[PDB]
Amino acid sequence: YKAAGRQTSADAISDTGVDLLIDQEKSIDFLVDDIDRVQVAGSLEAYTRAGATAL
């Protein structure tokens, strides 16, 4: 304020910004064959849990 004589004038304010882009879209997609579902030793629902764990 002292170097300015004793003058003051008002500045314009401004902003910065960043974009959160929601640009990721990812998928799981697999077949459970009915012949395999019948012929295997037990439940295949562990593959639905594996798909969820992968995402």
Partner: protein
């Protein structure tokens, strides 16, 4: 006289295609169906009978 009011009719029942009588599935052994609810091979074992001694 009635050129327009005598109906032609359609049977509501389809006539079956004849094919041939199936017999073999009743004539062969079916006991291995129970164990075979899973897997892709059934192993069937037979007895070798013990021999008779004098």
């Amino acid at each position: 006289a009635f050129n327009n009011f005598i109906p032609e009719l359609w049977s509501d029942m389809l006539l079956e295609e004849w094919t041939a009588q199936t017999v073999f599935a009743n004539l062969v052994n079916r006991e291995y169906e129970g164990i075979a609810s899973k897997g892709n091979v059934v192993h069937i074992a037979g007895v070798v009978a013990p021999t008779v001694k004098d």
